[PDB]
Design a protein around this ligand. Structure first.
Ligand SMILES: Nc1ncnc2c1ncn2[C@@H]1O[C@H](COP(=O)(O)OP(=O)(O)O)[C@@H](O)[C@H]1O
Ligand SMILES: Nc1ncnc2c1ncn2[C@@H]1O[C@H](COP(=O)(O)OP(=O)(O)O)[C@@H](O)[C@H]1O
Ligand SMILES: Nc1ncnc2c1ncn2[C@@H]1O[C@H](COP(=O)(O)OP(=O)(O)O)[C@@H](O)[C@H]1O
Lengths: 437, 72, 429, 99, 434, 65
């Protein structure tokens, strides 16, 4: 089955129709003000009429900021593209640090495109090139045989170059498209498999239906994928496109002229109405790790009119800005960007609310825990941390499977908590032996 | 007794959001398309436009071509 | 109803820069309110660039954070007018591993300046009634327009171009007499009867064959890439080009100078714009001086929000985050903060731009929020307030809903106050 | 596949004709010879297909339908019978299995 | 006398964790001795990995230098079994000038997870009788012989191109795949190759096969998610795997690979198995890789990982503030800490006794007193090196039993780090950059 | 220099074909052969650059370049 994930049990924000936050819903408890605050945010993203908005999440580590981000990601649905990003990902040797942040917007915004394609496919009965004086091939003559009928068509020397590229021979089934110009080969027909007792080529049955068929194909592509396709000529029918296809795909920066041309052609597609554009959501975790230069570019980036909504996550308080060497700023974010972003306050969980999280996670892991072990795990959790009691669930279940008990017991929790060490106790032990370290 | 699949659950649940087509689609996905031919999306960009004067006087090889002869 | 690529931003609520023939700014014009002296100086700079008789001059914009000088800069860019070179860059964008900082800044100075060249070419366009081809190969076609009807004969290359792209009866196309590329613009309504049916275009009018003068503006960086690389379109669009030799650039400068001496073409100075220049390296800070001292240089404007701050790379504290060498090279225009009376006007025009209906108590309390806190925070409050009003189903925003949004989102100062209480639990306080 | 090591006869009862066509297209790629019995082909082709079932080579299975396969006659060598689904009629399973 | 590529090593003698079915630690088993707490915890993580129902978990091991923190990881590594994937990486290995550290981390996480795929193919194996080819398309026949049955098959165009490309002549035992189309020549027949042309080529000989000519075989393989991502990212990049030139793979391709692998798991044709990622001396890793590791561990495909920390209360590289174990509180609190108790005097004698059976060196009873005292005053590693060199000098004296005088000889030849520091203090003024 | 450039077909031949791809220019005025005196200055850097690495600018029509 599916591997259990830490955030897998979170199905969303768990909000009612009035916008208020229920006590326990969608696998989330507490943070009523945060969830109720996000209830307007999901209505903004679903409204789509506003852009260039950034919402910062401020809270202690382990308070579910990332759970709120992924909860919004699950609340908006699968149609709304959601792009996670970490502050350490923007550093790359191939491209500049700014190009990553600029490409994350095109990768955030999604686009739905409907493409009408005309298809010519079937068995090839005869293929011959024409000969014209300059010994050059001006035209190609290829007949097509199908169960419905036979029709002879003429092809261009480029399509013939793709056929000879695919090693197409008489008696094989091929796939030909017009607008794209690419040529595919399905394989040899099954009727000829009897002449050879042993053959390397696999056989496919003869397809059915008319040779020429026009069909609509709805595909979802991202403006970053379009931006890379227009950036480098990886695909194509050109021999240089084949050589570049053999070359290594290193990352390169995209010019603002190409970006503006993309805005032009996509704007024309919107004016035609064939393409449907949907806004994306860009998530940034560990924003305090981002450089002051990345924030400097984020000034113009967030002020951009086409920028999708960006959510930030800050788990730290006042800290020195990266690269400044002197000035320290609240939440690791300088006052310039911090003035623009919208801050959401997150509060620590209460001792009563922690036990419910321990119970929900214990049920998610598939473990049966008695009320005594639940109260003990809650007690030690409030003594140290929630993450510790969350991590103590599985090993105690393992000891239960070893001893044969159907449920966890106070001796199992006591033995597991005896084996594992808390960060506070370990940090206290490091003081006595610190001289030996 | 055979359990259903993701295609049967999506086709059965999404259809209720003739009714005999559901009874015919319960055992196998005949109504919905299980196997459909897929091809990557091809995009063509407007070719670059260069002026005639930019073609004649555009390149720097035509000005230094004699100087480049002296380079050879 | 369809969502365009552009959406309402901070600078998008204003269109153009309101001015007068006497250069006396109105209180509210072209969406902008206040800053009479700032709009007057920016208007003087705009008239200077529109004159374009000089080159290599810099002017700096200074002001407190939240004064909207970036908004008056983008509004000046909108009021600049079409068909004029403009470039917007940031101080942090010039840093790249692919290209050097000097080649990137110089590349920006190249993209800013541009050249306008006019030509004349003979192009045929119209509806094609019939096409006949006999296989060398000899064929004739009929080109019909509303005014006149003509018949033409094709050579070998024209027959090849016709057999390359098949054209049916009565199709409006454009035939170029120079390159030979045949492009089909559309299909006639009556002739297209009896297919894909992609588009329909009416029969053209006027003379069939005309000589058109093409006005084409090229960029110096564009020409330099085209000449340096084998294919300059693949170099520029691919982004692989970098570290172009300066000798080729100098030769191109001399050839453009020869073009201006011939008078067949003209050069149009561009407008460079730099954002967040408070933090920048002394290499670029020093290179701007010589780049402006060059013969042909575009007119640039730079924005610095911060005040006196230590520059990057040195331990010296420069005034306005810029060294005295660059400060003395340009003129500074300072902007004053917005008045309380102008705050509610900005809020009202943002209600008209964002299509939000609020009350006078809403404008009053939000004006108090503009007095105690920056206006940007209020502009961020109303946007989330409209949605809460929609959830309340009311046709007008209420102060209670504004209190709900104000309870949902907190100011940076408030988050600092709570972060002072929880700061010990936070990491690396 | 478990019946392949056995090698008995297998008959498939399908109420829908499209499922029989998809069963022929799926069984054609598995190199498994079979024959389809429906109300489409003529009584001559059905008579030849029914008369060719005696000592049939490489064909271990047969395709049948509710009414068409439950029409009449008999299958002598048939042993294993598999029903795709119910025929929505009483006794139709026993009558279809009687062939 | 033959020496393999593997040689005796510090952690190489451990054959496993030495655990019972109850998972309770045994004092001496599978080459490991002592430290019942960390042995039991290692049993918990081994049983957990063998369960494989939970993903995205991190286990940390801390203790004093010389407590066997690496010996435990090698114990679970050898006790995990060959069929389960295991990966051991170091913090300095993920640092590279070609690719980014975070990309190397993604290669580690996607590298630890193994994927097992089974393949069933029918191949033809027999001795060639004759080969005939007709060139005007070339059409020829191939006659084969086996002890059970003699067969004759017809060859097609691609088949003749493959055989002629492989230089196949009559009298060679070959293996041909019908579906794949590959031909591999195993050798030649003794009797059929006894009479050959005057060329006289001597290469190899293979006996005639028996049984059915065409047989069905099952060959199982395992492929890494990083391997598939490199192959499909480089567009026929099979050479880039061994070349290592690939880097900075796009994330969209990785996402599509994850979705396609999930679809393969839904189909059942391919199976996914968990894997272990061992990291030693993680305290020197940059804090950026920690911030990326905390959020990157939340993925469903993120395997469980095990880190080790030698020291504690030390500032992180790139930051001026000290943190416990050189790790931020987010990660340190994000994973569980397992402390290792320092070894005692009683266990040292048994550890030194393991080298007697491992290295096949007979040790006298009087040598364990002085050698054990050297193990108490100095490092157990220096005690093991003293055992090795003591056995070398023992062979130099040609004795079967170890003598104390030889151990005194080695102790006179090699000095402890503290002693080298003591002499380095006397000669330190003459030394450079004192 | 030994270079060869093609301006276009003569204007007298433009009337035979109603549609022709080749452009047409009038007969250029001036002598067939013009003697002028040109003094060209070439820096050492351009010479050392062209001779430093293989030029590869012989034929732009090549796909390998
Ligand atoms: N309100 C909540 N209800 C249920 N589970 C929660 C809640 N908040 C946090 N969690 C769980 O706690 C775990 C750790 O949270 P974490 O991501 O460390 O929070 P933060 O991102 O604020 O540091 C998450 O896997 C999440 O599922
Ligand atoms: N003339 C104006 N009229 C109305 N609003 C303005 C004007 N100038 C600036 N603003 C407001 O200021 C905001 C942007 O301010 P910004 O340019 O970031 O200030 P600063 O340049 O000091 O950082 C916009 O949201 C806009 O609504
Ligand atoms: N449990 C054990 N059983 C046998 N030998 C051990 C054990 N633990 C450590 N050793 C021995 O101690 C020597 C030094 O261990 P070392 O690698 O310094 O431990 P650590 O990695 O915890 O510092 C190794 O050569 C190893 O043979």
């Amino acid at each position: 089955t599916q591997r259990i994930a830490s955030h897998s049990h979170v199905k969303g924000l768990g909000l009612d129709e009035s916008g208020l936050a229920k006590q326990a819903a969608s696998g989330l408890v507490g943070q009523e003000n945060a969830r109720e605050a996000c209830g307007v945010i999901v209505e903004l993203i679903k409204s789509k009429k506003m852009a260039g908005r950034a919402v910062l999440l401020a809270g202690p580590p382990g308070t579910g900021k990332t759970a709120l981000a992924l909860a919004i990601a699950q609340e908006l649905g699968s149609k709304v593209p959601f792009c996670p990003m970490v502050g350490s990902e923007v550093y790359s040797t191939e491209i500049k640090k700014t190009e990553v942040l600029m490409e994350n917007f095109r990768r955030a915004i999604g686009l739905r495109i409907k493409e009408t394609k005309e298809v010519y496919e079937g068995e090839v009965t005869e293929l011959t090139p024409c000969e014209t004086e300059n010994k050059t091939i001006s035209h190609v003559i290829i007949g097509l045989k199908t169960a419905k009928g036979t029709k002879q068509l003429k092809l261009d020397p480029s399509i013939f170059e793709s056929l000879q590229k695919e090693r197409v021979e008489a008696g094989d089934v091929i796939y030909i498209e017009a607008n794209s110009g690419a040529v595919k080969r399905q394989g040899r027909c099954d009727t000829y498999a009897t002449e050879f007792d042993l053959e390397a080529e696999e056989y496919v049955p003869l397809p059915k239906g008319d040779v020429h068929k026009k069909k609509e194909i709805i595909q979802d592509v991202t403006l970053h994928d379009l931006d890379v396709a227009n950036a480098r000529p990886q695909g194509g029918q050109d021999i240089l496109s084949m050589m570049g296809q053999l070359m290594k795909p290193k990352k390169t920066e995209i010019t603002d002229k190409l970006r503006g041309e993309i805005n032009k052609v996509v704007n024309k597609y919107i004016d035609q109405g064939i393409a449907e554009l949907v806004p994306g959501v860009l998530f940034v975790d560990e924003v305090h790790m981002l450089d002051i230069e990345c924030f400097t570019y984020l000034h113009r980036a967030l002020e951009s009119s086409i920028a999708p909504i960006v959510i930030f996550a800050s788990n730290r308080g006042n800290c020195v800005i990266r690269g400044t060497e002197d000035i320290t700023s609240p939440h690791g974010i300088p006052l310039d960007l911090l003035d623009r972003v919208m801050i959401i306050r997150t509060m620590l969980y209460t001792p009563q609310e922690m036990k419910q999280i321990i119970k929900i996670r214990a049920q998610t892991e598939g473990i049966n825990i008695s009320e005594e072990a639940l109260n003990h795990l809650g007690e030690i959790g409030t003594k140290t941390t929630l993450r510790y009691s969350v991590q103590l669930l599985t090993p105690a279940n393992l000891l239960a499977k070893i001893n044969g008990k159907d449920s966890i017991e106070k001796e199992h929790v006591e033995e597991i908590s005896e084996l594992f060490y808390d960060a506070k106790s370990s940090a206290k032990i490091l003081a006595d032996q610190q001289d030996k370290y | 007794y055979c359990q259903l699949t993701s295609r049967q659950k999506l086709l059965y649940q999404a259809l209720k959001n003739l009714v005999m087509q559901f009874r015919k689609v319960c055992n196998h996905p005949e109504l919905f398309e299980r196997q459909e031919t897929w091809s990557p999306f091809h995009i063509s960009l407007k070719p670059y436009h260069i002026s005639k004067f930019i073609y004649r006087h555009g390149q720097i090889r035509v000005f230094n071509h004699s100087r480049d002869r002296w380079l050879r | 109803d369809v969502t365009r690529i552009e959406r309402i931003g901070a600078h998008s609520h204003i269109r153009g820069l309101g001015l007068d023939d006497a250069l006396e700014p109105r209180q509210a014009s072209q969406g902008m309110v206040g800053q009479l002296a700032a709009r007057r100086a920016a208007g003087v700079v705009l008239e200077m660039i529109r004159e374009g008789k000089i080159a290599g001059r810099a002017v700096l914009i200074a002001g407190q954070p939240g004064t909207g000088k970036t908004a008056i800069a983008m509004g000046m860019a909108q009021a600049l007018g079409p068909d004029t070179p403009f470039t917007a860059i940031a101080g942090s964008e010039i840093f790249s591993l692919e290209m050097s900082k000097t080649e990137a800044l110089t590349q920006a100075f190249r993209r800013s300046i541009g050249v306008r060249i006019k030509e004349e070419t003979e192009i045929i366009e119209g509806e094609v009634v019939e096409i006949q081809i006999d296989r060398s190969k000899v064929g004739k076609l009929t080109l019909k327009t509303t005014e006149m009807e003509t018949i033409y004969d094709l050579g070998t290359k024209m027959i090849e171009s016709l057999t390359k792209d098949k054209v049916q009866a009565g199709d409006v196309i454009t035939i170029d007499k120079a390159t030979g590329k045949i492009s089909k613009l559309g299909r006639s309504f009556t002739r297209a009867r009896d297919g894909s049916q992609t588009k329909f275009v009416q029969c053209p009018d006027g003379e069939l064959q005309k000589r058109k003068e093409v006005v084409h503006t090229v960029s110096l960086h564009e020409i330099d890439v085209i000449n340096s690389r084998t294919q300059g379109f693949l170099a520029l669009f691919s982004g692989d080009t970098g570290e172009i030799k300066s000798e080729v650039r100098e030769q191109i400068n001399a050839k453009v100078a020869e073009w201006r001496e011939e008078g067949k073409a003209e050069i149009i100075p561009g407008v460079l714009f730099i954002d967040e220049v408070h933090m920048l390296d002394i290499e670029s800070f020093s290179f701007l001086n010589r780049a402006l001292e060059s013969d042909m240089a575009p007119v640039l404007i730079m924005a610095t929000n911060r005040g006196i701050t230590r520059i990057r790379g040195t331990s010296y504290q420069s005034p306005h985050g810029i060294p005295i060498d660059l400060l003395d090279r340009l003129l500074i225009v300072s902007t004053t903060p917005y008045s309380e009376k102008d705050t509610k006007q900005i809020l009202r025009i943002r209600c008209e731009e964002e299509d939000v209906e609020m009350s006078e108590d809403a404008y009053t309390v939000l004006t108090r929020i503009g007095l105690e806190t920056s206006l940007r925070y209020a502009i961020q409050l109303i946007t989330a307030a409209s949605l809460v009003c929609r959830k309340r189903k009311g046709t007008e925003v209420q102060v209670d809903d504004i209190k709900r949004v104000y309870s949902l989102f907190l100011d940076e100062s408030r988050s600092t106050q709570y972060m002072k209480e929880y700061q010990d639990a936070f990491l690396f306080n | 596949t478990r019946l392949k090591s056995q090698g008995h006869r297998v008959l498939i009862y399908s109420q829908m004709t499209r499922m029989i066509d998809l069963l022929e297209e799926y069984m054609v790629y598995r190199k498994h010879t079979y024959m389809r019995l429906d109300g489409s082909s003529k009584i001559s082709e059905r008579r030849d297909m029914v008369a060719d079932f005696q000592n049939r080579n490489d064909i271990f299975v047969f395709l049948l339908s509710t009414r068409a396969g439950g029409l009449g006659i008999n299958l002598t060598a048939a042993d294993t019978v598999i029903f795709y689904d119910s025929d929505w009629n009483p006794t139709v399973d026993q009558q279809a299995m009687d062939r």
